Symmetry: D3
Subunit: 166 residues, 6 copies
């Protein structure tokens, strides 16, 4: 299988505000995505951290989309029903095609986690295609991100990139 | 855990026609919802019964939304593919935010019931948020309503109400 | 249980091009659909083969819809994320009502097939209602079509036809 | 021509807050609508005053829609681009059918007013049909309301009610 | 200037029913369209007559779209607010791209006709593009069809066909 | 009246291709916008030139939206029915609120020009609000841009900016 190039975006107001104050931050979810993607033979070619702000989130995504070498963009954060969760409403609109089934299949595997169960209906984690690039909008939770990567992204992303570019 | 205030809406033309004549009605599904809610420490602060009529359905929901003390509205009926089933089409247009995953997660738990299985794809049961209130639109079937309450609403609704109001 | 009348549409550019040249084609998925329907007491009252072309797909479907005796239309092909897959985007527009849950329940059954698993989120197989006729848009894959027929269509299609004509 | 029955809704936060404090209010726009509708042989069968609040606006409309004798509902207020203008976004969704051309034709006649001109593109005044009733969502401005009534509503509303009920 | 090939579709339930009975019909609007097109150097390469039935309307349009030589499809009938008027709702779905401004510019020219004026907001006449073919959905009214042809279609249709095939 | 800060975006593949080679460019439409704005006391705080490419268009707009000091963004190009015109389809998906009437009011003033007339229905020029900023998407034609600026933007934009920020 090909090594693919990934850009990672963390959407977290608390962490962004610390970055502004030059304070130490731990980005557990972003770290997990990088670690797993690298462990599996892929490359991280960029990373950004933004708060729950429409314009800032759009700029983070367009910056990544504008790098020709990027194959896949993965974000973590802002896909639930907190009043300030706006990631899906901001980005999903931009997809050339929504990968419609990613949302329900992610909720299916989430429902199977005995620590999640019915909480599965409280995520809007989504995937789509823009140009020849794939985009995954994942939850803030480290366990959720790990689940999405291992069960859904790592096994199929190669074939999906191939397919979209065929 | 917090006692929450619920408003129950039964959508049934046959039962509504009896109501108009003050003839006896058995509302099995509405009664199941009320009983399960009370057994779990919640309160029923309102109830209404309407037929499959767009205006009457809209009024039933707006009358409930107008009560400041209501936290959650649950309806039963009119969420399938009978020509006269219009509940979801009517009330989705009120949502501030659709709780998108409720539909497929409800169909997942329904499919898993060996008495239901593939019949799961014949429901459009849905949920959403209007203001600081949660709305669940459930099937007419007593067994479907019991499943939704026990497996999906009772376990998650407290945290969901908190989240939407945070 | 009614014998129902089915019209079968294969959407395959490679096979269509062979047709034009008057060469042998082998349509495994269409053949599977026909055999499983007949074996279950249903009738095949028409069949057509078209490429991934919008107008030709629309014509195939409207020709079938224009036959009063047709109860159900089932197509195979063009429901994935290949750049040329346009079946769902083309026909889903024509639905009076989308049978919304067919998509996710199909992906649920697909995901539980140990040979498919995560590949489940790469399909957009869908169903809908036009007039008093039911329409299923299935994948090109022979295994997917068998799964859809055995698990979802054959068990519920009788009741669904009844229901929409109620 | 028939005498038709109208329900008038004023959407104004300032006026609503005075009503709560039992203070005198002047509703110039509502008064103009009543006066002109009555001068032209029609009847006013109800009136309500609400602020720019989604739930309160929905309740005002459903209350009017639920009166069988009502033929037409006319509202004034909240159809522009103030952050708090939400009338169109709240009600337009509820239409069975939008009367699509009302919006642009109203902007056409507004553009012709030498005191409005290009300000015409800053209104979203709209019309639609719910059940057998017509709904007009008009601006807050008295001159705008007068214009809508004289040029668009009074001349055509009779035929439109007839048509919708045919 | 190209001679273009036009297909003409009349949507009229009363005239269709006469056809079935083999009685004389008189189609004034279709006749106007044909005469004005021919008089302007264009060709009529097909014609059909259908009632206000979704499937029959879809079949009329797809039959025309399936003729390679057809450049433009023009229909007359079913674009108002009669409960049986379904032309726009049916065909507008099929557009690759809606020619968005045809609707309001048609209503502008209509409004300026001193015999139409405010009746202008009661039409939904529309235009769109499917493949490399242009489609105009015009009212049933003979005067409306003449106006559309003379003021909007004949002057711009050549350039529009050129443009979409660019 | 307030001096406002504008960001001008030219969308032209031919000019962008020249830019890449640092070949001379004449951008008549962009220059007209800049000149009229400056003559009316406004400031140009940014400019970019992009081709008809979805990602590049999205980046141009997000780079402008990211400048706190920008009040209004005006683009020229790609708002017609050429197959490669994608400006409106791309940027409408960014709007918080579409300024719905800008489209038809622009077509009204365009139709009124005797050099344009029915050509008015071949544009999709649009406007919207993102955050506290206004966005106008104008045609490529120099005469169209001049008309939009003088008749629709310069007279109303000051009050509109105030309103959106109130
Ligand atoms: Mg665990
Ligand atoms: Mg059981
Ligand atoms: Mg005046
Ligand atoms: Mg001039």
């Amino acid at each position: 299988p090909k090594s693919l190039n990934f850009y990672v975006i963390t959407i977290s107001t608390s962490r962004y505000e610390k970055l502004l104050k030059k304070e130490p931050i731990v980005d557990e979810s972003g770290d997990i995505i990088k670690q797993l993607l690298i462990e599996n033979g892929h490359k991280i070619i960029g990373y950004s951290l933004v708060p729950d702000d429409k314009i800032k989130i759009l700029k983070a995504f367009t910056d990544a989309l504008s790098i020709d070498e990027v194959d896949v963009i993965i974000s973590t954060g802002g896909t639930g029903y907190s009043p300030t969760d706006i990631t899906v409403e901001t980005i999903r609109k931009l997809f050339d095609r929504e990968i419609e089934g990613f949302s329900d299949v992610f909720r299916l595997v989430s429902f199977n986690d005995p620590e999640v169960k019915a909480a599965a209906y409280l995520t809007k984690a989504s995937a789509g295609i823009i140009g020849k690039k794939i985009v995954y909008l994942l939850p803030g939770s480290p366990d959720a991100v790990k689940l999405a990567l291992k069960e859904l992204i790592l096994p199929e992303v190669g074939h999906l990139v191939y397919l979209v570019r065929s």
